[PDB]
């Protein structure tokens, strides 16, 4: 990406050689993944603002 | 552009900027419009 540029398009990404064709599954995961933030984790994994 | 008393006035790409020049009278040309999709989906 370019500096100070944001990417917003939530196109489904083909995570391998299996085409999504609009179907997320094997070797097809979204480019966006959610952080697993839990209070039990120590420093280095805790959420930071 | 002539108006006589169909769609024949398509919009023009902005590219990197526009230079405009006109010798017509002040009351003839009265502003401009800019955008991306020219509709609600863009400012």
């Amino acid at each position, epitope marked *: 990406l370019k500096p100070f540029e944001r990417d*917003i398009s939530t196109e489904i990404y083909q995570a391998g050689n299996k085409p999504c064709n*609009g179907v*997320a599954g094997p070797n097809c995961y979204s480019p966006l993944q959610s952080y697993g933030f839990r209070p039990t984790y120590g420093v280095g994994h805790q959420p930071y603002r | 552009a002539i108006h006589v008393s169909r769609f024949d006035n398509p919009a023009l790409p902005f590219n990197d900027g526009v230079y405009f020049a006109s010798t017509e009278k002040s009351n003839i040309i009265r502003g401009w419009i800019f955008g991306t999709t020219l509709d*609600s*989906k*863009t400012q």
Partner: nanobody
Amino acid sequence: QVQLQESGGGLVQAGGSLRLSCAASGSIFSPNTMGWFRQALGKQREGVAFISSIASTSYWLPVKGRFTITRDNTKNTVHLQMNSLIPEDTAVYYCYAVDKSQDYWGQGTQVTVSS
């Protein structure tokens, strides 16, 4: 402030049908990309489907035919159609509006199916 009115959930028998819906009101922008997220009981949240402003649809599950998205451009709301329910989809649904500046979330709807 942004409010996401969610409705349509409840208890439905297996093989039933219903209509989930949410209206996005308040300060929205123009791209307005929306969709749905499923949360199983005590499990992680996954994306159900997504609809953009150009009618482009992206389903994040092998759920085609089961789930169908309809758009209301005049009021700009999203409806999801539940048909041929199976017990495996018993999860709470929150629709998601990533939009342009700040993404938002719904409050929750309980969709339940069992036999």
